[PDB]
Amino acid sequence: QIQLVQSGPELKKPGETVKISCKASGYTFTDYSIHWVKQAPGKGLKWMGWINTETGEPTYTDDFKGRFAFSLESSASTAFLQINNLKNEDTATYFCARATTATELAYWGQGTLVTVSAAKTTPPSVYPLAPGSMVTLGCLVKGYFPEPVTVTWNSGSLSSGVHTFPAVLQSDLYTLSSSVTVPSSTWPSETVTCNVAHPASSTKVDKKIVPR
Amino acid sequence: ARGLTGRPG
Amino acid sequence: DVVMTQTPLTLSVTIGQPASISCKSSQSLLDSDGKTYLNWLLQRPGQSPKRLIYLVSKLDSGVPDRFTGSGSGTDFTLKISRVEAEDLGVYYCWQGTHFPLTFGAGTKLELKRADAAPTVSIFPPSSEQLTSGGASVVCFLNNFYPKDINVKWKIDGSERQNGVLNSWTDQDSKDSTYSMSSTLTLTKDEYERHNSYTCEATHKTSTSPIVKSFNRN
């Protein structure tokens, strides 16, 4: 019955503003505190402060005093988080939480991902990786934005020894790699192809892996 | 009615 | 701020066996009203955090009775009598006694298994990336355990620490191993000034590294 639903994912450029919401249901909204917590990707948790849902008074911790504003629209049981003059380091998932008597962070929202980047939509360059009972091959997907990309092998026919790794930022754009392991009798006697999709640029590439 | 860290309502 | 120190940061567990996590604080968490505002959270993969224990030892609504929390003053502990697949993820202890609220660094529970050394595969830059002016040399270190591993690069016997970017997978849901990808990015000109390129895997399963090389010739 007690739920807090946050707004969807946001892609913003440096210097812009973003306002995310948290709609509460199941209780009398002005009876408990709303808290804000940041989690940068792959990192721990950090409390940003809270807002008083009866008086509307906000409290900010040291690192969030300046470019951050907490607000309410009590009639719609909603709390907002506005960040101005966005910077790269603001990239993270933001959570709203509601307090109970003994604990400040009791009920949690699903989180809202904010990504801050000056990059423009760019398709990836897909390169085959051939080795210079088993054999390991791969594909390098380099220089794309935004995430994500889907990587498949032989249109899904190959999926046993597949490792598609997390993308990494290299010069404002994303780079990723995938590896496949197959029997030595199967390649290069037969064809092995990596299929790479990037919906944001309407790109779809097929790259056959040839000995080299 | 609310403490420094927001406990409770 | 109060510093929350969780030990260990990575705890290897076995389904059916008990687990224990320590959390020490830089100052006392006994508050003015005689209560101790020390809580525990669990954050499973791809999900938001979720309340486990509050007031040191009180389990929250619908939390499995097999989770035990205890302690006082500056020393606290979370024990799991018998661990399950549902219990896997990142556990954080956090305090509400002093402003501002602070969290520990997190303790990730992984599945223990037998040590498996990595299979290394090195690949030279493709003819396609080369014709475009680029040069990326890739190395995969697959299905190894435990997660800790060191990767080394050498151009004509001589190391190169700059221009290396790494990436790691989550623990495999089937075999419980980890895999790593390491890429060495260079300019095309700088790639054609050296002949031998090597990737090394230093893992505890051997006093010697697993070396893979290829020469541009």
Same domain assignment for residues C102 and C144: no
Same domain assignment for residues C11 and C96: yes
- Could you give the number of structural domains in chain C? 2
Tokens of C129: 């990336």
- C42 near C69, Cβ under 8 Å? no
Residue A191 CB burial class (10 angstroms; 0-12, 13-18, ≥19): exposed
- C80 near C14, Cβ under 8 Å? no
Q: For C96, left (φ over 0), alpha (ψ -120 to 50), or beta?
A: alpha
* Last residue of one domain, picked from the residues C98, C113, C128: C113
b or e along A48-63 (b: 16 or more beta carbons within 10 Å of the residue's beta carbon)? bbbbbbeeeebbbbee
Q: How many residues in chain C?
A: 217
- A175 near A167, Cβ under 8 Å? yes
Q: What are phi and psi of A76, to 5 degrees?
A: -105, 20
Residues 1-9 of B with CB under 8 A from C: 4-5, 7
d(CA C104, CA C111): 22
Experimental method: X-ray
User: After which residues does chain A have a break in its backbone, defined as C to next N over 2.5 Å?
Assistant: 132
* Last residue of one domain, picked from the residues C87, C113, C139: C113
Give chain B's count of helices (H) and strands (E). 0, 0
* Last residue of one domain, picked from the residues C78, C113, C148: C113
- C184 near C137, Cβ under 8 Å? yes
Report CA-CA distances (Å) from A163 to A124, C155, C194.
Answer: 19, 26, 30
Same domain assignment for residues C39 and C108: yes
Nearest to A54 by CA among A72, A70, A68, A76: A72
Same domain assignment for residues C65 and C95: yes
Note down the domain range covering C56.
Answer: 1-113
Residues 66-95 of C with CB under 8 A from A: 92, 94
* Positions of E strands within chain C: 4-7, 10-13, 19-25, 38-43, 50-54, 58-59, 67-72, 75-80, 90-95, 102-103, 107-111, 119-123, 134-144, 150-155, 158-159, 164-168, 178-187, 196-202, 210-215
Name every residue in C having a CB less than 8 A away from some CB of B: 96, 99-101
* C98 CB-near residues (< 8 Å, 6+ apart): C1, C2, C27, C29
Same domain assignment for residues C150 and C202: yes
Domain regions of chain A by residue span: 1-118, 119-209
A52 touches chain B (CB under 8 A): yes
The sign of the CA dihedral C164, C10, A39, A166 is positive
Q: Where are the alpha helices (DSSP H) in chain C?
A: 127-131, 188-191
Which CATH number is A119-209's, of 2.60.40.10, 1.10.3720.10, 3.30.420.40, 2.60.40.420?
Answer: 2.60.40.10
Does A125 sit within 8 Å of C96, measured CB to CB? no
Q: What are phi and psi of A29, to 5 degrees?
A: -45, -45
Same domain assignment for residues C118 and C81: no
Q: Considering the domain A1-118 in this protein, what is its CATH number?
A: 2.60.40.10
Residue C126 amino acid letter: S
Instruction: Name chain B contacts of C96, Cβ cutoff 8 Å.
Output: 5, 7
